[PDB]
Structure formats: C-alpha cells, structure tokens
C-alpha cells in the first residue's frame, strides 16, 4: 500500500503538525542566538550523501529540522534582529502563501486562473491609492501594476523596457552606447540589472554623493556627468533614484532628477524597496514627491509590508513598454484581459496576489499605518537614547525606522573605524542581538534598523543595554595600540 502523495486526510494530519511546529517557533524564537554560530560545511557532514530509497516519517524529518536545520538559521524573525532590512511577515501574509501553495495554480495566462490575474490587478490599485500614486500608475487611469519576486528582477524588466524603447527608435547596434545612471549609494541590483540586459560594464555610472547632501544624489552632479557622456558620444538612457538606500537609508530627490532626465529623454525608475511602504502614511508621503514624472516605481512588500518573502510591487506608466520588450509574440502584435507574463521575466507566474490581498484585508489601512509607525518611533527612541550617551554619535539623519551610529574613541577615522569594527563584532558574537554596518563617506557606522514583526519596545531597550554594556567594557580598557593596527 502506498497512500497518494496528496491524500486530503494525510494533508490535514501533517499540516497541523507544521502549524504547531511554527507557532512553537515564534514562541521560543528568542532563545536561539540570532546570527547562526555554525562552521561552514557543518551540514554536509550531518546529513547522508544520497537520497533515501524508502520513505522517512515526518516525525523524523521534523526532528532533524530542529537539530540540523534550525541551528543553521540566522533568525530573521527573531525580535532581537536588526541586521540589513526587515524580512517583515505576518500571519495574514503567511496564510496568503498557504492558500496560494494549496491551490498551486500556474497563472501564466488569464485562463489558467482568472482570479489569479484579476485579483493582482485589484490589489495593486488598492496599494496604489494607499500610496496616493497618481492615476497614471494604476488601472483606473492609464497605467498598471505587477507583482514579482525581487526589485532586481523588477528593475531589470524596466531597464530592458527603456532599452528596447530607445533601440527601436535609433537602432540595435547602439546598445554599446547606452548608459545607466545611479548614485554610489544605489544598491548593486541596478548594476546587475544592467549587466544582464547587455548594458556595457564600462557604461555604468556611480555618481558621487556627499555628506553635505546626506549622501543623496545631486541633480546638479548627475547632469554634469551626462554632458560628459554626450560629449563622448554615449547615449544616456536610464536613471534610478533611490528613496531609502541600503547603507545610510539616504533619500534621493526625484523631482529635479526627472527634470534632468526629461531634458535628455531618459527613464526614471524610482527605487523605494525598503522605504516605499511607509509612504502610505501622509507624514512620509513627501519622500516620493516627484514620482509623477518618473516612468516607474518599485517597492518591496516583503521588506516592510508584512507579506512574507518574496513579494515586489512594480508600477508603470507605460505597461506596453514591458509588453514590447518581454513578450515573445512577433513585434507586429506587441503594438496591437492582462497577460502578466509579458510584464516580467517569469512565465510560470505564482498566485502572489493572495499574500497582499490578505494583508490589506486582515489589518486594514489604519492598523497597517500604525505598524510602520511603531517601527519608526522605536528607532526614534533608540536614536534619542544614543544621543543622551556622550560616547556615541549619530552619523547620518534618520529617515525611516533605521538609525546609524558610531562609538567614538576618547587620521583617527582609521582608528574610530577599527573601534566600531571590534565593538560591533563583539556585540554580534554574543547572539543576543544582530546588526550590520556600512562604510559611508569613509566613516564606519553601525546600522540599527527596526522592522522585525515580533519586535517590541522591550527589545530595543535590551539592545541598547547590551550596546551600553559593551561600550563600558570596550572603552574601560582603551589603548590606541590595541586599535592602531
């Protein structure tokens, strides 16, 4: 006897085990060290080298999940986790994938699941109006929205949409002259997107940012660089302002960047990946002011909107530009029911809209706003606690729920960077908290970003006390010779 792999009753049986296994996880997630403490190669030695010929009980697999898999996790959901940007999830977002995985439809056209395409077009207008985007970006007006996996894939489709738009006008042999623009703080997804699309690696620009502008891109400096490319015979094509960069959570001013990009007929993709979600709150919406002149806008719902990884939201003014670059239909039908596969790189589309649908319904706009707000006040609190300690300084202004700081010693920039390097890694090696760094403007600053869904105010104070405890211990036995190397 061999029970069918999709037995409804065995599905129910084993399914409840995991739901209780994961509920127990979120309950006791505080007890593991946040950053994993295993050595590289630990798993190849604790597991067999071949697949088993006969079945293994789930009660055995779940046990090995506890002893082999779990010690090899860096607990992104731990309430004492602040590294990088949040992997923000929720119950509503979790059950979104569960229904999407249970149904297991492949929405590569409208017929394969009408609801999997039409619902995505509804909730992208829900989230559009919440962000108060102009009618040019959503389906009520003359635009559209698509759900994908990464911003990097979303930036790519946009880049090739802009690229093909230009090369269709002037010719394909000029791909070696197209230039892609971003600041030196723009995330490395823009560079990778350029590399894949056939953009020349010598034609990728990392415009310099200064501390005077808090490391935001200067429309003056950008246009300076463009004139160099035009004088050199290059074709400027694609510029990517960022609202909430990865290192110093810096913000670029889009309204004068579209000014410059309009002059030289460019594409303005605006990349709020992390910080885009906070713009559903009126007090933060000013950060994407000037997005009405850009060609596309990108935010990542798994970073700061409780929809589980992965879920990336792309809005475009001209969804036909993606159709003409990504559809495999002949080039005389792309200019003539939504076929969302022509808006992205993934043909086998997933029922990703169920995640967003359940998050917006199960919490509503009012509570969804306060969630993001609470993460901002918690970091705002952390920023104020830093300020009342004369041993720390704030390196750059806080914009959205992430604080950058540094423990100054009693050029010394080399010395203050080795101090923070040793101070940070000592706090991180305890396993009690986890937070990363960034070298911005030569300074070595520690990044404290609050966003874990299970993070409460008591955890920020716990991290503050641990930062203070090591501050005492590090500076108490201070000696330049220990850090002057």
Ligand X SMILES: Cc1ncc(COP(=O)(O)O)c(CNN[C@@](C)(Cc2ccc(O)c(O)c2)C(=O)O)c1O
Which residues bind to ligand X, rule: CB under 6 A?
84-85, 87, 106, 108, 150-152, 187, 189, 242, 245-246, 271, 273-274, 300, 302-303, 309, 347-348
Check binding of 432 to a second copy (CB under 8 A): no
Among residues 31, 44, 169, 477, the one that binds a second copy under rule CB under 8 A: 44
Look at residue 413 and give the partner it binds from a second copy, ligand X, none, a contact being a CB closer than 5 to 8 Å depending on partner kind.
none
Specify the residue, 275 or 474, whose C-beta has the smaller distance to ligand X.
275
Using the rule CB under 8 A, is 322 a contact of a second copy? no
**Interface with a second copy (CB under 8 A), residue from 288, 291, 358, 379:** 358
Q: Which is nearer to ligand X, 192 or 208 (CB)?
A: 192
Residue 242 binds which entry of a second copy, ligand X, none, CB below 5-8 Å type-dependent: ligand X
Count residues contacting a second copy (CB under 8 A)? 142
Q: Using the rule CB under 8 A, which residue among 90, 158, 183, 298 binds a second copy?
A: 90
Interface mask (CB under 8 A) for a second copy, residues 160-179, using x and -? x-----------xx-xx---
94 binds a second copy, rule: CB under 8 A:
yes
Contact mark string toward a second copy, 114..133, x via CB under 8 A: xxx-xx-xxx-xxx-xx---
CB-nearer residue toward ligand X: 308 or 420: 308
Smaller CB distance to a second copy: residue 20 or 289?
A: 20
Residue 246 binding: pick among a second copy, ligand X, none (C-beta 5-8 Å cut-off by kind): ligand X
Is residue 336 involved in binding a second copy (CB under 8 A)? no
User: Cβ closer to a second copy: 25 or 462?
Assistant: 25
CA angle 121, 452, 393 (to 5 degrees): 120
By CB under 8 A, residue 206 contacts a second copy:
no
Q: Does 54 bind a second copy (CB under 8 A)?
A: yes
Residue 176's binding partner among a second copy, ligand X, none (Cβ under 5 to 8 angstroms by kind) is a second copy
Q: With CB cut-offs between 5 and 8 Å by kind, which of a second copy, ligand X, none does residue 235 bind?
A: none
Beta pairing, strands 402-407 & 392-394: antiparallel
Instruction: Report the distance separating Cα 74 and Cα 106, nearest Å.
Output: 31
């Amino acid at each position: 006897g061999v029970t069918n792999p999709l037995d409804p009753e065995e599905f129910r049986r084993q399914g409840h085990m995991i739901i209780d296994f994961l509920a127990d996880y979120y309950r006791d997630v505080e007890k593991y060290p946040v950053r994993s403490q295993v050595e590289p190669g630990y798993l190849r030695k604790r597991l067999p080298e071949t697949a088993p010929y006969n079945p293994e009980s789930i009660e055995t697999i779940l046990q090995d999940v506890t002893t082999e898999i779990i010690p090899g996790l860096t607990h992104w959901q731990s309430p004492n986790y602040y590294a990088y940007f949040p992997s923000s999830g929720s119950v509503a977002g979790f059950l979104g994938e569960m229904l999407s995985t249970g149904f297991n439809v492949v929405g590569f056209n409208w017929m394969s699941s009408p609801a999997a395409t039409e619902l995505e077009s509804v909730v992208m207008d829900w989230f559009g109006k919440m962000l108060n985007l102009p009618e040019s970006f959503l389906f009520s007006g003359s635009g559209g929205g698509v759900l994908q996996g990464t911003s990097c894939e979303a930036i790519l489709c946009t880049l090739t949409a802009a690229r093909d738009r230009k090369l269709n006008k002037i010719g394909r042999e000029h791909i070696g002259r197209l230039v892609v623009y971003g600041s030196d703080q723009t995330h490395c997804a823009l560079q990778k997107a350029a590399q894949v699309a056939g953009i020349n690696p010598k034609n990728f620009r990392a415009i310099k940012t200064f501390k005077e502008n808090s490391f935001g891109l200067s429309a003056a400096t950008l246009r300076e660089v463009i004139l160099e490319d035009i004088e050199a015979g290059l074709i400027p094509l694609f510029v990517c302002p960022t609202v909430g960069t990865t290192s110093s959570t810096a913000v670029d001013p889009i309204s004068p960047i579209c000014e410059v990009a309009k002059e030289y007929e460019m594409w303005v993709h605006v990349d709020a990946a992390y910080a885009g979600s906070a713009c559903i709150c009126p007090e933060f919406r000013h950060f994407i002011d000037g997005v009405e002149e850009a060609d596309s806008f990108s935010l990542n719902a798994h970073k700061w909107f409780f929809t589980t990884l992965d879920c990336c939201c792309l809005w475009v003014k001209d969804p036909s530009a993606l159709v003409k670059a990504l559809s495999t239909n002949p080039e005389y039908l792309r200019n003539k029911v939504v076929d969302y596969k022509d808006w992205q790189i993934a043909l086998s589309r997933r029922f990703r809209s169920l995640k967003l649908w359940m998050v917006l319904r199960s919490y509503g706009v009012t509570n969804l706003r306060n969630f993001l707000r609470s993460h901002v006040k918690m970091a705002k609190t952390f920023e104020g606690l830093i300020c009342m300690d004369g041993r720390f300084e704030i390196t750059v202004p806080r914009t959205f729920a992430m604080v950058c700081f540094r423990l100054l010693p009693p050029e010394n920039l080399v010395l203050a960077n080795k101090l923070n390097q040793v101070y940070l890694e000592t706090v991180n090696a305890t396993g009690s908290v986890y937070m990363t760094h960034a070298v911005v403007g030569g300074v070595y600053m520690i990044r404290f970003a609050v966003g874990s869904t299970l993070t409460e105010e008591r955890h920020v104070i716990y991290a503050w006390k641990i930062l203070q405890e090591h501050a005492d211990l590090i500076l108490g036995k201070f000696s330049e010779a220990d850090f002057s190397s």
